[PDB]
Structures are given as C-alpha cells and as structure tokens.
Design a protein around this ligand. Structure first.
Ligand code: MN
Ligand code: MN
Ligand code: MN
Ligand code: MN
Lengths: 237, 237, 237, 237
C-alpha cells in the first residue's frame, strides 16, 4: 500500500529528472500520475522548482483539483484533473514549454508526423485557442476548471494538445509512456522545423501513422532505461 | 549594515554565475544593483572575467558612474548609472549579448511577445540606434553619460532595450527579476526566430500582454531556486 | 581467438559510447561488425539501451540474421545482415536517427557534399523509399529480409543510405571508419542545412568528390583517438 | 631561453584546449605561433588528436614548413608557414572548421560584421577559391607551398580568410588574439545566420568597422582568463 505508493512517487521524481536532463522540461512544467489504487485521485508535486522535487513533495488531488495538503500547489493543476476525468484511459499528464515544440503553439503550420518516432501524434497535434471562447484579453493560463475543460475538449482523444501562445500537454497510459512521447515529440518538432527550411516535406501517410504508431512497444522501457542511465552518468541520482 | 551589504553582493555574484551557466551572459556582460540602503549608489563588479567575480570584486558607484575604488571599472558602467537616475523604480540593470536576442539588435523585425513568458516585454523591445544622433562612425559602445543617456531615453519606461549592432539591456525591480526576465527574453527570442521560419506567427494581443505580464509573481523565485540548484549540480558553487 | 574476439567486442562498445557522447546515436540505434574470423557471421548487441551495452551483451548472428543466443535481439538486425551479404567489402554497419541528417530522410532536397569532410558521400546520399514497392501503409521499419534487401539495393555501392521517414545507415570497411563517417555525415548535413538558408550553395564538384574522398586516411584514427579521449574526459569509460 | 620557450608551448596547448572546450576547434584543426625568439621559425604540434596535445608534442618548423623533428607533422602546416613569411606582423595562425562559420565557405553570401564584436573582420571575410587557378578536381586541401601561397594571397592584409568548401584561417599578433578572434568570429557568423532568416539585416558601416575594430584591447585578456577559468571548472586542466 504505502510501499507501492512510494514507487509511484519515485517514478514521478525520476520522470521529472529525466525531462529536465533531456531538455524537455523547464523551470515551469510538471508531471502527474493517476493514483493506480484510486482513479478519483492523482498525484502532483507541490509548487516548487522541478530540480528540487522529492518523493516527500508529492500531493494528493481529487478530480476537482483540490488537496488536503496544506502546502502550495501548481495553479495549472486543473489541466491534469480535467483531463483525467474526461480521459479514463489516461494515467499520466505532462505540461511543459518544450523548446522545439513551442513555436507550433503560435504559428499556423500544423505539427504533423515526419518520422516513425512521431506516429503517436496522429494526423496532427490539436491546438487549443483560448480566444475562441474567451476573447483576446486573457492570461493564456490554464488556472480554472472551465478553461481547462476546453483544453481537454480540444485534446479530444489524441495524445497531445498545444495551448496557443503557452505550452504543450502530453498524455498517456503510464508515466514512462508520457516521458517517451514527450521526448520524441520534441525531436519530431525539431526535425520538421529543420526540414521546412531545407526543402519540401513528404509527411507520413495516414496509413503509416496508423501502422507505425503501434510499434511503440518495448521501446518505451528501453528509452526509460537509457535516460535513467544517463541520469546516473551525470550524477543526478 | 555590512551584513546586509554582503547579502546584496552575494546575490550579484550568484546572478552572474546563473546567467553564465544558463548561457545568457558571455565573457562581456555585467549586472548591477542599486544600493538598497542608498538610491544614489549602485554596485557593480570591477572589470574582470565574469567567471572570476567574487563578493570582494564589487565596486560602489554614484549616479555619475564614478567610484573611489582604485581598481579598473567597466567602461559601460554609464549604461547602469544613466538608467538608475532616469528610472527610480529600477533596482537592477543587466547588459549582455544574449545569443538568441542578439540578431534582433541588427534586423528590422521587432521582438514581440509570442508566449505568456514573454509578456513582460510589452508591445515590442525598443531599439536604441546610435546613428540617429551620432552618425555611422561611432564605436557602438555605451562609454559615456550622454550616449548612455539616449539609451535610457530609448528604454523609456519599458523592461528591455536593444542597442543596435551591440547588445541587450534588461531592467527590473530586483536582481532576481532581471535574471528571470533575461532568461525568458532569451527563450522568447529563440522561439520567435524558430516560428518565423516555420509559418505565420500569431502574436500575443495587447490585451494578453497586459494580463499575462502580471502573473510573473511567485514565478521569479521558483526560477531563481531552480537555476541556483542547477549551479550546485554543476559544482559551480 | 577469444582474445581477438574480445577486442572486436570492446571496439563495438567503444564506438557505441562515442556515438552517444558525440550526439550521433540515440536510444534507438545500433552498430555491428562482421566477424573478422568468419565473414558468414557478424556481431550485434542484444536489444538493450545503448548506454548499458557491455562486451557481454554482444550476440553472434549469421547472414540470415539469426542467433543461437537466447536473449532478445534488435528487430532491425536484418538491416545489417542483408547489407553484409550484398556488400562483401563492408565490415561494419551503423543505424541511427542522426539529428542533422534526419530531415533529409523526408524532404526532396538531396544531401550532397559541401566540404571536403563530406566527400565520402559521393554524388549524394541515396534514399530508400518503402512506398515504391510496398505502398503507404507500412510501419516504415526494416524488420524483414525482403524489405531490408531493398534497402541494401538502394544503398548499392555507396557509403550511406537514408530510409525515408525513418533514419540513416552508414557502412564502411571498419568500425572506426563507420564512426568517423557517421560523425562527419552529421556535421556535413548540419552545414548544408545552415547554408541553404544563408545563400546559394556552391557544392563540391564530381572531381573534388573523387579526389577529396580519398584523403580520408590517417584521419580515421586521429578522430577515433580524439573521441576516445573525450570519453575519458567525461568519465564515460 | 628554454624557460620562455616552454611558456609559448604552454600557451599553444591552452589555446588548443580552450578552442576545443568552446566548440571552435574539431578533431581536425591546429594553431601555431611564430617563435618570439626567431621570426624564421614557428611552432606547431605534431600530427595528433587535439585533445591529446601536450607541450612535448610541439615541433619547430622553418618558413619552408620543414622540421628536424622525426615525428609526423600536419599536412596543412604549409598554411601557417606561407602566411608567416607573407605577413611579418602575424605571430599566430589558426586553422579550423568552425561550425557556424563553415557555411560561409560554400555560399555566395559574404560574412560581414553585424555587431561590434565582429568589427575585426573588416568589410567582409575574403574567400580563397582553389578552382580559380587549379580547376575543380583538387582535394581542396592546403598541402603545398604554392597552393598555400595563394591562400596567403587571398588573405592579403585581413584578419581572416575562408578556404572554399574547406575551412577557416584566423591570424593575429598573439595566440591570445587569435583565440579571441576565432571565438567571436564563430559567434558573429551564428548571429548573422540567425538574422538573415529573421528579417533584413542592417550591417555595421565602414565607419563603425574602423572605429569599433580598435576597441579590442584589454578585452583580449579578459576573454582568455574567462575561457581559462572555464577550463578549470570542467577539469580540463
Ligand atoms: Mn505553463
Ligand atoms: Mn557590451
Ligand atoms: Mn531505426
Ligand atoms: Mn583543414
């Protein structure tokens, strides 16, 4: 019970370290996990610098984004809650301002798969535009259930969603899957960006997207072990 | 008195280390702080390699950019003084040749906010052009009160100002704020540059700039703690 | 016999470490070597994270891509086997998703030599397109002798071949040669990409490609020693 | 005598380490220094991996590019000799394939100063084209007095010269000056490249080039101390 819970906490901390070391996550970003013992709950670190998060910093939240914990929480915690209630299949949610992906949050050009490693994206990454329903005078943040409800809405049933002029949200069935996807989404965006200025891009076909987006099997763990080893090499625990 | 003064010195040294480790500052760059005990004075390190600056290297300057210290000072110290006298609200001034931002110092394209993290910029970063009043035969440097007076002039009441074909100047109400802003100005410029070659950019609206540029609250310290932790991880003190 | 075999194993491990440290190889990538004692066999690490590969992880495969080893193998092992049987001169094969090169896997613009260091490429890097013979509903992978047979086919007698929307394959007469070529192919692609957006590119002539592509002599070992030293500096063994 | 000579050797080794750590120099690159005791001689490391060069690896060459040393020498040593005899004012010569600068070696767009830090370039960096006098079937190398004589010719009286489809050559009155210039030439090229794709570039005027290119005084040593400190921080001696 408490032993298993500690394991989930450790994985979130590890995922945070990996995302930071691999340049995916910034000072502002956070990853959560649905309590594997109780779907009505999820775990998320208190509002702190990512590089300082430990297992003792994880808070317990309900699907309403509220916690009994007396410590300060992330304002964008509602991004996680709203998605978990709308997507029962999702077990982990990650929010970042991933460098290479960021530009796609404010340009018309859609982020579409260009290599097999990006197939999990689907046709293209959906873009949530807060102006559509709230005008152009908002703070662009996701600090409310209603706004974050629209974000889940735009996400639909896909694997990723971009928040215009803000950042990126990655979802998946496990912390390891979300970390893997976040890493390759970043590499895919970098590749497409380079390609757009080298010549005409020939994208993956809907058929290849369907077929290739299914070979992301034993790959998830290999990636996790690799990035984990890289953490040991850097002495980042 | 001397205890508090040492704290301000330590923060300047830390800020210097952070800016160097995060790739914002180069061999040429420097940050100052208005004496919190005396507005007519400000602190700035003697002319030395940034990586070698210690608390014992900080000099005391008046609003005329002069010091009793017998050690060599930065030639561009006038950039700091002239701004402090024109902007009483400013408590810290930073000058660098921040990589991603640098190109905006010599192209017509204005640096405008594209994500919420850049909202503090305002409509766009003003550009100081020395040729406007001094012709095209100058050294592009800011080594004189009159020239640096025009720089403060171009800065006006904004948060940043670019010196054409030279570098960037960041201002703020605290050392921590300037470090935070300098870091995100660099990330914002990088993002816009990438975006311009990916597709058509949809910028933040004046309304979002006003609203989002106000959520830069508890964020400042989280960033400082994160970059500070990153310094410990690298063994850079 | 076993002493010499261990030396070949050690070189593969070293090459893997070098490619990872130099940013050529990713979590997904692998290098093999034809058994110098038996051409009908080649060596390749079992399916594991590259950063964890040791000499005890190398497997023995026949030219049919099969091993007596009971441990899991790479699915793309057929890429190596099919090339070794078609190219007797090749003693090492490397597969990666080399960052700078990757975009050329999905754009019309051909990767042509622009500096003497890229002369080994030949006129341009051939591109294998799985759609040509298998339609646009495949997984883009090279997990079968027939598909990988076409890859060898597209490679022909050249030094490199790109697998559309997938990755890159480097071949050579020695592990050291393939590592050298993989490193410079990455630098060459980076250079051309930068050049295409700076101005009009004046490529190497067929004559320079022939003459310059022959000075890659004692250079191979200097590079190997340099990257090997860089590994010691980083404490990566 | 031998004490002073050792100091010159130490500086060359340090410069090599700095250029490697700052990403200016690659496996292939080398720096030399005119013997301050005898202008008819210059020092250059034997043909080895840059990361392995020590004071005991430096060779003595005459202005004909020949040495009594029995150890292998760099084939491009003639690049250094030919320049020293044509430019008595030059005391150090550096050859590299500096990343950001490299593209300018094969595109029509000239590398012109865009910030005060690049003023030392002059109007633009001259480009040596081997095809002009030797056709398009050469190895693009500088392995002969006659060819290298033309390189010195193209260099003229400037501070830098590009060898088409090959690399870059930096000259100066001291090892420290060449290291400083090589570092900023790289940053300047990076900046211009970024700028060209952001908008219309407003270059430094001939007047600013003349005036700003003279403030490169005490700056040289600050840079040297900074990069030297950075070497200690990395434990690279
Ligand atoms: Mn956010
Ligand atoms: Mn400056
Ligand atoms: Mn692959
Ligand atoms: Mn060369």
């Amino acid at each position: 019970s408490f032993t298993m819970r500690r394991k989930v906490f450790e994985e979130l901390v590890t995922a945070t370290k990996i995302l930071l070391n691999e340049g995916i996550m910034d000072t502002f970003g956070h990853i959560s996990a649905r309590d594997p013992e109780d779907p009505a709950s999820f775990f998320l670190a208190q509002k702190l610098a990512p590089s300082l998060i430990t297992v003792d910093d994880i808070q317990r939240f309900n699907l309403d984004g509220e916690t009994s914990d007396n410590r300060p929480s992330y304002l964008e915690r509602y991004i996680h809650s709203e998605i978990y209630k709308t997507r029962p299949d999702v077990q982990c949610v990650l929010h970042t301002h991933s460098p290479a992906v960021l530009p796609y949050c404010f340009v018309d050009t859609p982020l579409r798969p260009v290599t097999h490693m990006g197939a999990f994206i689907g046709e293209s990454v959906p873009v949530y535009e807060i102006r559509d329903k709230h005008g152009d005078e908002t703070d662009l943040f996701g600090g409310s259930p209603d706004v974050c409800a629209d974000i889940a809405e735009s996400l639909g049933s896909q694997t990723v969603v971009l928040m215009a002029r803000h950042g990126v949200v990655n979802v998946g069935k496990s912390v390891r899957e979300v970390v893997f996807r976040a890493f390759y989404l970043e590499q895919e965006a970098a590749a497409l960006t380079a390609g757009l200025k080298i010549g005409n891009v020939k994208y993956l076909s809907p058929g290849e997207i369907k077929t290739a987006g299914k070979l992301v099997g034993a790959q998830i763990d290999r990636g996790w072990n690799h990035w984990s080893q890289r953490l040991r090499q850097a002495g980042l625990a």
